[PDB]
Amino acid sequence: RSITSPLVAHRLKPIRQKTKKAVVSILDSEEVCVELVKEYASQEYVKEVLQISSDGNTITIYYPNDRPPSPTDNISRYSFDNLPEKYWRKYQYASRFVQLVREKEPKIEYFDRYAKCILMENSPGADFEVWFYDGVKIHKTEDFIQVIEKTGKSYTLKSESEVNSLKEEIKMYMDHANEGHRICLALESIISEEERKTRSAPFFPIIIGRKP
Amino acid sequence: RSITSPLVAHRLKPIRQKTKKAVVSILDSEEVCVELVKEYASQEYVKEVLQISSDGNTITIYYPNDRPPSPTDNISRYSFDNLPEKYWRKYQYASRFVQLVREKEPKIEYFDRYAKCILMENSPGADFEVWFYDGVKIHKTEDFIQVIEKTGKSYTLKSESEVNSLKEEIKMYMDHANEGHRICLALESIISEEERKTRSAPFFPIIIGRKP
């Protein structure tokens, strides 16, 4: 708990990503599995299966001795708080993969007067992309802001301290982009509060308005 | 006002519906024009143009003596409340045209556990269509409820004694549709309440969730 936040894979599209360290996948049930694989002879196979619940709270490990291996009798279960030092690095690897996905998949896609405002799933501090209808793009991250001109020229900035030195050509775009970012954030809280009151379908992702 | 409610053409797609009596169209400015047409020589033309504001409150009529002609000096203006008996019938013609459009264009398109719930623009009492993933359809109007079974059989319900005559197989569907209806209406009110506070682009139409 002291190293990383719980893995949350709510509302993510299913995917099976094969990497050099392990094969990590998001299931249709929103659970995340990491398959530890080892090379042998002319065909590799699975050595250990780590399955993390969609909220990151419950972890099960099994191995019966391109699809998820079936559950077996040789299965152990731990809670997030009671995760051993073994599997510690493995959980974080799965978390990194999930963040890589949450950073790209949108949560609120809002079409305003001048741009397509996209609020990403990787909350808190969720990434926010503003695609202006004129070709200009602003990409807001928690750490930095990327600004791209219509001609393909681009540059990165960092923070509020740079505002009083910003050219008007960008400042007007930014004044709007921050208004759009506020609106998406305001709606997220407003709808999320309504979502929590009803045991029903999720209310995300949402699309507001239509592109012109 | 005692005859019809004001014409409202907010958030509607542009359209030009041509008849042999008049041409009624929705502009990209959300204004609605009715062009009175008469046959002339080898090419028919417009004799009088009536322009209704997007909220139905302001009506202007002009004619200087395939799109609306530019405004002229021979123009008169009325408010909705003091609209003369002359041209009264034309306002109603445009009003019914807009309602036909508002009845079909969606406002909230919500994907729940079992159906695609569509809340239409023709508020108050907006039509609500529930398209179940298994093929069952329930169409709720202010006046009646139409139920279409998965096998193609269909019937309408006009009174409670008929609603309570439904098979339990269908009552389960109707109970679900009513919960979907409540949620869409609750969100419609909640978002509208936020929309009224924000000097920005409209917050409708919206899509909630993704088809499974």
Author numbering:
A (entry chain B), B (entry chain A): 3 to 67, 76 to 222
Please give sentences taken from the publication describing this entry:
Next, we systematically mutated the four PC3 residues to negatively charged aspartic or glutamic acid and generated a condensation-proficient (CP) gain-of-function mutant (i.e., the S698E, S700E, T704E, T707D mutant). To gain insight into how the CP mutations alter the physicochemical properties of CPB, we determined the crystal structures of both CPB CP and CPB CP_v1. While extensive efforts to obtain a high-resolution CPB CP structure yielded only a 3.7 Å overall resolution, the structure of CPB CP_v1 was solved at 2.64 Å. Therefore, the structure model of CPB CP was generated using a combination of RosettaCM and Rosetta/Phenix crystallographic refinement (TFZ = 16.4 for the initial model building, and Rwork/Rfree = 0.2709/0.3092 for the final model). An individual alignment of PB1 or PB2 of the CPB CP_v1 structure with the respective domain of CPB CP showed a Cα root-mean-square deviation value equal to 0.6970 or 0.7679 Å, respectively, well within the acceptable range of two superimposable structure models. Notably, the PB2-tip region is composed of a stretch of mainly hydrophilic residues with four conserved hydrophobic residues (i.e., Y750, L752, V758, and L761) scattered along the disordered region. A large fraction of these residues, including the four hydrophobic residues, were absent or lacking their side chains in the CPB CP structure, a striking deviation from an α-helix-containing ordered loop found in apo-CPB. Interestingly, while WT CPB exhibited only a low level of ANS binding, the CPB CP mutant displayed drastically increased ANS binding at an elevated temperature. This suggests that the conformation of CPB CP renders a temperature-dependent dynamic disorder and that CPB CP could be condensation-prone due to increased hydrophobic surfaces.
